[PDB]
Design a protein around this ligand. Structure first.
Ligand code: CLA
Ligand code: CLA
Ligand code: CLA
Ligand code: CLA
Ligand code: CLA
Ligand code: CLA
Ligand code: CLA
Ligand SMILES: CCCCCCCCCCCCCCCCCC(=O)OC[C@H](CO[C@@H]1O[C@H](CO)[C@H](O)[C@H](O)[C@H]1O)OC(=O)CCCCCCCCCCCCCCCCC
Ligand SMILES: CCCCCCCCCCCCCCCC(=O)OC[C@H](COP(=O)(O)OC[C@@H](O)CO)OC(=O)CCCCCCCCCCCCCCC
Ligand SMILES: CC1=C(/C=C/C(C)=C/C=C/C(C)=C/C=C/C=C(C)/C=C/C=C(C)/C=C/C2=C(C)CCCC2(C)C)C(C)(C)CCC1
Ligand SMILES: CC1=C(C/C=C(\C)CCC[C@H](C)CCC[C@H](C)CCCC(C)C)C(=O)c2ccccc2C1=O
Ligand code: SF4
Lengths: 143, 41, 80, 100, 159, 741, 97
């Protein structure tokens, strides 16, 4: 498995428009694109409010927040058993593959992802804040 | 009627019965011994 | 960003990763000196701080801990 | 392109993609009479910089408040500038103790 | 049962504005396009002058007819015009400091016109453009307040 | 056929074994308590029948039988009121002298000195002066005896037993199937034609035959013991013909369409009876006949089992336009499949109806000697206004519950609901703007006037003297309704109300109703009302439209309708739930209706209510609403502080209970602030430090003490807030108006 | 909305016959004299009041003028007739029945 490049020629679900879609944030800093392949034309709920019809085959959707994309991801996986992957798109044109970063979904293991932010102590084994006092920035003993 | 008497032994029913009893006892004490400001009898 | 630490009481139940609405956590093999899996937090720059992960952690005390740090556009969950 | 067959995402058109549109702007150069435009480009020539405009605003506002307190409030015939015109509530301190 | 009116914005159902009669009726679009705010090729100082004339002329009325000296015959108009001059001055100050605060990041994405052709950014939305716009607003607003007084004095049917 | 009786036979065994197992209805509560949160959840989930099961049949059966229980309880309550009027009343004394005797139907036992509440109400009677209007209602029905009230009480108890039997029967013995509940066409046909049509027709008949003659003799000075009993009027047509000559002709003028012959007892007089200050019962009888015919024709509108009628699905699916897409497509399924949608609509209209009732019963007093019983009038207005506000907030709540639970995007594609959710941002933005605009241009007017009056500039206020904000539209409508019998309602003899204009009706020296003049203060307070209403709508509609998702939380429907938060993240998501939007809409409904009823009380006591001592009306407060209601300090001084002199000086009187409840409602209100201003995390730690002391002495309970949930903390807080505020206003109003009126 | 890519400019499908026909369907019945108006008509009395209030042009009508009743009723019926005519015409041309 390798990082898939976002195909921009992907169609979009049938949606009549809303007011919960993109804002100036998409034009300024970043927005999000979620893609999935549907087996049949089905009506799903938009996280922005409203009902859209996903097309048979590949479907592309734009969102201004990662939580929107993962809400739709969990809806498509739990109510439709699809396998969506979403990206972070910048106004520069730079696309950053995000969700199945390893290819598999993070609730399952893929044998090759490296563990991060794992404290190898108990949560009651943290030092007192008097030990991390004057650490430059204001810090928690968990570091 | 084992289940009915189990229902009557529930916390709200027992509380209602016990507090009706306590309030009635206090009310009858205050009817027959009215205005007890001090222990003098 | 918010600080999401994971401690060595993790039992690999994967419920923290299932419950994260931002894909901040994942399950890594054999970093904890434990059974098969241990939880990780490689994407804490996307963490909003909902603490849905540590609402779903069954260990006592929590094996996943979210310490609310400095706010950003992603941490504050802004579509604008 | 971007409108072809419900393809609302284009990497070569990020303006249409993100909704970066001028919904009502028109770039026509011709609006005003050129003598009027000259008059008003020259009237603002001195204050067309931030520092100059804030200097004008400071000068005008400070002068205005100072002349309003010195002269303008009395010209407006404000009650605070006329005075009580009466003995006031002087000897009526309280209902019980009529204090000065 | 054809002919629906409300459409997504520029046909994009995921941007979220929902073009609508109040938004995109040709009379409304025309009127809003002809306003000096949306004359993106015209110099910001002159658009500011027009906007300021309009606003200084309009916001004198309330101060004249509803102010604290509204019941004094010849003093109502003077006091209201001066209150409006002060408010215009404050607004020019606010415009200046807005131009100082806002225009530092220089956005990089381009603009289009709901038709496909990319246009240049409004010079108004720069430091120099907004500074000259605020200068024009001050000049035009004080001029419009003075003209509001002049109209109090010369209009036949002014009450 | 499609519309038929369909029931399951003996679906549920009548047994006490589930009484002995608390929490049987839930799978999460059947496991027994380990914490006290279980004890609270057992009561929060008791009537959430759609969370017990998920099939609509058992839900609907539970709902039907619970409605039967509610009706049985209402019947117990009505029979109790009639019985207390038959046994513990001064009603027979009040009939003979209703202008001097205070209605009382509750006697207090002399136990702890509380026999002081048994006040001198009149009629050789000692009791609590009631404010329910039951005496006037009974006199309108033509009771004239305690025996009739006693037998009405017995009938009410019989009907309550019938209702409880019917609930048991329609749940346990023969419970209707789902297809029986989904016959909304037949339900509407029967509820319009039968419940409202036959009901109004039967009441019209009672009024033709019992109320009108009895009250015509009562208004003629006849003592109630000399009046013929209703059955003597039913049997003897000669007595009725002596009272109303049209009865000599029989029912022939009805079938010959010579209906004008019945103009003796079917009138269009309008206005008020000058003897009683209430509506003409002939007008009322004609009214009920008319609306009976109207509802009986309305109940023949929907298609049930024969070809004639309408399919509501067709009406809906045909009503669509260029702006609304598919239109009302998919709403028939919503309203035949979701109980919460029906409850939303029905509570909305029922509360609006209760408020309309409040506004229409004070202006057109329908009962004799009701308008001059100022306490009854004020209490009825206040009561029905409050009930309406509560019902409306519940409509918001259950619309949100529908949106969370029963909403399906498959059945709603490009229909009105989808299109409302799709531009909710515009709706709520414009509602927010109008709320802010109204708040400014309503309350800032009061602030401007307070500032000007404090600064010594009354000529700069928004008053009827300085800067008049005259409600000219309402004044025009007043003048138009006043002049209606002249041009636009020529067969009416007088206007519907005296509030439009004209002369006053004085009954017993007191003003029954008199023209209400609208001025600048009325403008300001009506815009205050509009403001508070718009903000309540804002909160509740925002909870409805943002119940499933938001820009903050896109998966809010999965968290549920009733959840505390999502977390301290995204800056903090406290009270994003729709339940919390109901929780806040309750505060704002309270703040709205408090001003509504304050406006009513002050306007009535200043410009309507009062005495006619000489030729000239002396109002209660003296007509100070016009000049003092311009400021907040006027409402504080001339209404709250002034009119509190009767509730705080009531100690040692029969109104001392009102002062006691005033203070106690203040206490409860402030006590609500411990639950509203605080959070669960302090109280759980305090509870565990107390549980330490219980464990030390071996009295630590097995049901672990928990703090109230966040949602329950908020619910307790708002409940105590509403109770305290409303009971404070209740005591203040009643102690004031029983004394001064 | 698979259609409606550009907010069609002819959002109101204008028929110039619609305003004329609504005006004539309302004002002609509104020119029928009836018993309640004293033999006069609603449009007749409305125009009579328009004349009586144009006789002092600056001074607007009073609250007790009866010009407002005629105004509001006439325009209720007229706006209703015009909008229902537009709706009916554009439903006849389109589907909707
Ligand atoms: C904590 C504060 C407080 C205190 C100390 C009191 C104290 C008192 N109140 Mg006040 N009161 C309070 C709060 C308080 N009250 C509140 C909040 C309210 C409003 C609800 C009232 C309202 C109120 C009223 C309206 C009245 C009182 C009265 C009284 C007196 C009651 C005397 C009595 O009943 O003798 C009872 C005597 C006993 C001996 C009973 C003791 C209990 C048992 C029976 C003893 C055990 C015997 C034996 C072992 C039992 C064997 C087993 C049994 C099952 C057979 C007393 C001075 C009354 C009074 O006269 O005051 C002057 C009165 O009329 N109070
Ligand atoms: C909404 C229903 C309702 C309410 C709130 C009341 C309230 C009251 N009733 Mg009434 N009552 C009702 C329905 C109601 N009643 C009905 C339906 C009947 C007919 C069966 C009666 C018949 C009745 C009688 C015969 C008497 C009351 C009495 C009372 C008072 C004291 C009751 C008591 O001490 O309970 C005690 C409760 C327990 C011990 C438990 C109280 C004001 C008494 C009263 O007012 O005396 C002056 C009294 O003697 N009630
Ligand atoms: C003695 C007769 C009887 C018996 C044995 C049962 C037995 C049963 N019923 Mg049935 N039922 C009956 C009468 C009876 N019912 C009647 C008369 C009605 C009509 C209202 C119903 C309506 C009904 C429904 C709709 C449901 C049941 C259910 C049940 C089951 C458990 C109910 C439970 O937990 O009870 C304990 C509950 C109570 C004791 C609560 C009673 C509340 C009453 C009705 C209202 C009182 C309000 C009160 C005045 C408020 C005062 C406030 C206070 C502050 C003063 C069980 C099979 C439920 C079930 O799941 O069955 C499978 C169910 O959903 N029943
Ligand atoms: C003329 C026929 C008729 C009448 C009078 C009613 C009347 C009523 N229905 Mg409706 N209903 C009808 C036909 C009718 N229904 C049909 C055909 C259906 C099937 C589609 C339904 C389905 C239905 C549901 C699903 C519900 C009601 C409810 C109600 C009650 C609402 C509360 C109210 O207004 O209190 C007014 C109270 C009174 C007027 C008191 C008198 C009550 C009398 C005794 C009952 C009415 C006669 C009854 C319908 C016929 C059977 C008689 C019985 C002896 C067998 C009300 C009593 C609601 C309710 O509260 O349920 C209990 C409810 O949830 N009904
Ligand atoms: C539901 C409403 C209602 C009811 C019940 C009545 C009832 C009555 N009206 Mg009233 N009335 C009403 C509405 C009503 N009215 C309205 C709305 C108006 C205005 C138009 C009037 C105007 C009006 C006038 C002007 C008069 C009446 C009269 C009457 C009486 C004569 C009935 C009659 O001749 O009709 C005929 C009715 C029937 C034939 C039905 C009787 C059927 C019986 C009950 C069958 C039962 C037999 C059973 C199966 C076997 C025996 C049982 C057992 C012994 C074995 C009767 C008491 C007249 C009168 O004398 O009043 C004192 C009269 O002059 N009414
Ligand atoms: C026709 C009226 C009606 C009906 C049938 C329902 C029915 C329902 N509502 Mg709705 N609701 C209504 C009116 C109605 N409500 C109104 C008017 C409001 C605004 C206040 C609400 C607000 C509301 C909310 C906010 C919620 C519901 C919920 C529910 C469901 C469960 C309620 C429950 O288990 O409570 C059982 C009963 C109790 C817990 C008792 C409450 C006692 C109150 C708080 C105290 C007041 C008592 C008294 C008046 C004060 C004096 C008492 C004295 C002792 C001091 C159920 C479907 C809940 C739901 O569906 O959850 C998903 C939910 O979250 N409703
Ligand atoms: C262009 C037409 C026009 C003009 C110049 C005026 C001008 C005026 N009107 Mg008139 N008015 C008009 C149209 C007009 N109105 C219309 C269409 C209506 C409806 C009114 C209703 C109206 C009322 C009700 C009142 C005025 C009043 C006034 C005066 C103060 C405002 C001012 C002379 C006020 C006045 O001075 O008297 C006043 O009370 N006007
Ligand atoms: C549009 C907003 C217009 C509001 C005008 C207003 O409310 O004036 C409100 C003031 C009210 O003026 C006050 O009225 C009170 C009435 O009791 C006082 O008694 C005094 O007359 C006076 O203080 O009207 C005027 O004095 C100015 C009249 C001219 C109105 C200007 C309209 C501007 C054109 C608007 C459309 C473009
Ligand atoms: C009240 C003002 C409503 C204004 C009005 O006249 O709207 C009327 C307009 C009529 O829409 P349609 O004719 O398409 O509706 C057909 C009906 O059967 C509903 O589907 O409703 C809308 O466009 C949506 C609501 C807009 C709400 C705008 C609020 C301002
Ligand atoms: C108050 C009360 C009470 C009582 C009540 C009552 C007493 C009621 C009654 C009721 C009634 C008593 C009713 C009746 C009814 C009747 C009717 C409703 C009738 C009808 C008729 C008709 C509709 C007709 C038709 C027709 C004609 C017209 C002619 C011929 C043909 C025909 C038949 C078709 C009680 C106790 C419960 C308690 C609670 C409260
Ligand atoms: C005071 C308070 C508490 C503490 C309140 C406690 C836990 C509830 C107390 C209810 C009663 C007193 C306990 C019931 C015990 C028995 C049922 C009573 C029977 C015996 C009696 C005679 C004593 C909270 O848990 C809380 C949570 C969230 C926001 C605000 C608050 C809050 O303000
Ligand atoms: S952190 Fe907690 S929830 Fe997540 S895998 Fe480890 S034990 Fe399970």
């Amino acid at each position: 498995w390798t990082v898939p490049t976002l195909n921009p020629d992907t169609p979009s679900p049938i949606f009549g428009g809303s007011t919960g879609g993109l804002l100036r944030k998409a034009q300024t800093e970043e927005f999000y694109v979620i893609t999935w392949e549907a087996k049949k034309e089905q009506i799903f709920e938009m996280p922005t409010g409203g009902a859209a019809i996903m097309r048979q085959g590949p479907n592309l959707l734009k969102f201004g927040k990662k939580e929107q994309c993962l809400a739709l991801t969990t809806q498509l996986r739990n109510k439709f058993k699809l396998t969506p992957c979403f990206y972070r798109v910048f106004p520069d044109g730079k696309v950053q593959y995000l969700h199945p970063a390893d290819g598999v979904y993070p609730e399952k293991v893929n044998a090759g992802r490296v563990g991060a932010n794992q404290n190898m102590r108990r949560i009651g084994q943290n030092v007192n804040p008097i030990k991390v006092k004057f650490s430059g920035r204001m810090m928690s003993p968990a570091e | 009627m084992k289940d009915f008497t189990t229902y009557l032994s529930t916390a709200p029913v027992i509380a209602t019965i016990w507090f009706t009893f306590t309030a009635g006892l206090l009310i009858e004490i205050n009817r027959y011994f009215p205005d007890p400001l001090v222990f003098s009898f | 960003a918010h600080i999401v630490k994971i401690y060595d009481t993790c039992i690999g139940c994967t419920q923290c990763v299932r419950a994260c609405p931002l894909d901040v956590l994942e399950m890594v093999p054999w970093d904890g000196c434990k059974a098969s899996q241990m939880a990780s937090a490689p994407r804490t720059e996307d963490c909003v701080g909902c603490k849905r992960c540590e609402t779903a952690c069954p260990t006592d005390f929590l094996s996943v801990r979210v310490y609310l740090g400095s706010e950003s556009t992603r941490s504050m969950g802004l579509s604008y | 392109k971007y409108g072809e067959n419900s393809r609302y995402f284009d990497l070569q058109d990020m303006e249409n993609t993100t909704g970066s549109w001028d919904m009502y702007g028109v770039d026509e150069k011709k609006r005003y009479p050129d003598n009027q435009a000259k008059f008003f480009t020259q009237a603002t020539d001195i204050i067309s910089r931030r520092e100059s405009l804030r200097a004008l605003v400071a000068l005008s506002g400070i002068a205005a408040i100072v002349t309003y307190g010195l002269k303008g409030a009395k010209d407006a015939d404000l009650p605070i500038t006329k005075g009580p015109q009466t003995t006031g509530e002087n000897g009526k301190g309280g209902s019980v103790r009529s204090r000065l | 049962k054809k002919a629906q009116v409300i459409s997504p914005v520029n046909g994009d159902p995921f941007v979220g504005m929902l073009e609508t009669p109040v938004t995109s009726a040709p009379i409304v679009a025309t009127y809003l396009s002809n306003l000096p705010a949306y004359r993106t090729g015209v110099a910001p100082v002159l658009r500011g002058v027009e906007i300021g004339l309009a606003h200084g002329f309009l916001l004198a009325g309330p101060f004249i007819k509803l102010g604290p000296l509204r019941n004094v015959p010849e003093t109502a108009e003077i006091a209201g015009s001066l209150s409006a001059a002060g408010l215009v001055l404050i607004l020019a100050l606010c415009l200046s400091i807005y131009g100082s605060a806002q225009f530092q990041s220089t956005p990089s994405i381009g603009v289009k016109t709901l038709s496909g052709r990319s246009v240049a950014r409004d010079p108004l939305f720069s430091a120099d453009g907004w500074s000259e716009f605020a200068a024009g607003f001050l000049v035009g607003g004080e001029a419009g307040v003075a003209w509001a007084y002049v109209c109090t004095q010369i209009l036949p049917y002014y009450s | 056929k499609k519309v038929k009786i369909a029931v399951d036979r003996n679906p549920v065994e009548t047994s006490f074994e589930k009484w002995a197992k608390p929490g049987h209805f839930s799978r999460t509560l059947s496991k027994g308590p380990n914490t006290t949160t279980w004890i609270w959840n057992l009561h929060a989930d008791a009537h959430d029948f759609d969370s017990h099961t998920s099939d609509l049949e058992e839900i609907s059966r539970k709902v039907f039988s619970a409605h039967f229980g509610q009706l049985g309880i209402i019947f117990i309550w009505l029979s109790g009121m009639y019985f207390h009027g038959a046994r513990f009343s001064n009603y027979e004394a009040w009939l003979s002298d209703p202008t001097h005797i205070k209605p009382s139907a509750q006697v207090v036992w002399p136990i702890v000195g509380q026999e002081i509440l048994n006040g001198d109400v009149g009629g050789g009677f000692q009791g609590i002066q009631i404010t329910s209007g039951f005496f006037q209602l009974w006199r309108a029905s033509g009771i004239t005896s305690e025996l009739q009230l006693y037998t009405t009480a017995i009938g009410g108890l019989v009907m309550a037993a019938a209702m409880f039997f019917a609930g048991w029967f329609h749940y346990h013995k023969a419970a209707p199937k789902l297809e029986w509940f989904q016959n909304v066409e037949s339900m509407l046909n029967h509820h319009l034609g039968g419940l409202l049509g036959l009901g109004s027709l039967a009441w019209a008949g009672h009024q033709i035959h019992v109320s009108l003659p009895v009250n015509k003799l009562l208004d003629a000075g006849v003592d109630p013991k000399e009046i013929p009993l209703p059955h003597d009027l039913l049997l003897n047509r000669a007595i009725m013909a002596d009272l109303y000559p049209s009865f000599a002709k029989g029912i022939a003028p009805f079938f010959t369409l010579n209906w004008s012959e019945y103009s003796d007892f079917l009138t269009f007089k309008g206005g008020l009876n000058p003897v009683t200050g209430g509506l003409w019962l002939s007008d009322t009888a004609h009214h009920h006949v008319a609306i009976a015919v109207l509802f009986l024709v309305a109940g023949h509108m929907y298609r049930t089992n024969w070809g004639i009628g309408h399919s509501m699905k067709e009406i809906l699916e045909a009503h669509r336009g260029p702006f609304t897409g598919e239109g009302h497509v998919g709403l028939y399924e919503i309203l035949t499949t979701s109980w919460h949608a029906q409850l939303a609509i029905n509570l909305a209209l029922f509360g609006s109806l209760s408020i309309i009732v409040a506004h229409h019963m004070y202006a057109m007093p329908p009962y004799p000697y009701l308008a001059t019983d100022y306490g009854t009038q004020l209490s009825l207005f206040t009561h029905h206004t409050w009930i309406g506000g509560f019902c409306i907030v519940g409509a918001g709540a259950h619309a949100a519950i529908f949106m969370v639970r029963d909403y399906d995007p498959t059945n709603n594609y490009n229909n009105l609901l989808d299109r409302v959710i799709r531009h909710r941002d515009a709706i709520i933005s414009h509602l927010n703007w109008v709320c802010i605009f109204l708040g400014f241009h309503s309350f800032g007017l009061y602030i401007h006037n307070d500032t000007m009056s404090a600064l010594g500039r009354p000529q700069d206020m928004f008053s009827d003297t300085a800067i008049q904000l005259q409600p000219v539209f309402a004044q025009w409508i007043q003048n138009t309704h006043f002049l209606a019998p002249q041009l636009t309602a020529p067969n009416a003899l007088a206007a519907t109300s005296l509030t439009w204009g004209g002369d006053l009706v004085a009954v017993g020296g007191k003003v029954a109703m008199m023209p209400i003049s609208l001025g600048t203060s009325d403008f300001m307070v009506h815009h205050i009302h509009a403001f508070t209403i718009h903000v309540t709508v804002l909160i509740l509609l925002k909870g409805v439209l943002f119940a499933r998702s938001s820009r903050l939380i896109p998966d809010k429907a999965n968290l549920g309708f009733r959840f505390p938060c999502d977390g301290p993240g995204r800056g903090g998501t406290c009270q994003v739930s729709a339940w919390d939007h109901v929780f806040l809409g309750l505060f704002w409904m309270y703040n709205s209706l408090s001003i509504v009823i304050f406006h009513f009380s002050w306007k009535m006591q200043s410009d309507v209510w009062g005495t006619v001592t000489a030729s000239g009306v002396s109002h209660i407060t003296g007509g100070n609403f016009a000049q003092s209601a311009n400021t907040i300090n006027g409402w504080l001084r001339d209404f709250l502080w002034a009119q509190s002199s009767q509730v705080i000086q009531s100690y040692g009187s029969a109104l001392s209970a009102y002062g006691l409840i005033f203070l106690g409602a203040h206490f409860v209100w402030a006590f609500s602030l411990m639950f509203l201003f605080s959070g669960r995390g302090y109280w759980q730690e305090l509870i565990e430090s107390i549980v330490w002391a219980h464990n030390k002495l071996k009295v630590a309970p097995a049901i672990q003490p928990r703090a109230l949930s966040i949602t329950q903390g908020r619910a307790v807080g708002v409940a105590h807030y509403l109770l305290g505020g409303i009971a404070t206003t209740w005591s203040f109003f009643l102690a004031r108006i029983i004394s001064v009126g | 909305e698979a259609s409606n890519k550009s907010f069609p400019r002819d959002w109101v499908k204008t028929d110039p016959l619609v305003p004329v026909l609504g005006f004539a369907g309302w004002t002609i019945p509104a020119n029928i004299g009836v018993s309640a108006f004293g033999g006069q008509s609603l449009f007749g009395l409305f125009t009579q009041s328009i004349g009586e209030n144009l006789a002092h042009f600056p001074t607007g009508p009073a609250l007790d003028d009866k010009f407002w009743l005629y105004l509001i009723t006439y325009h209720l019926g007229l706006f209703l007739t015009i909008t229902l005519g537009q709706i009916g015409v554009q439903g006849r041309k389109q589907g909707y029945w």
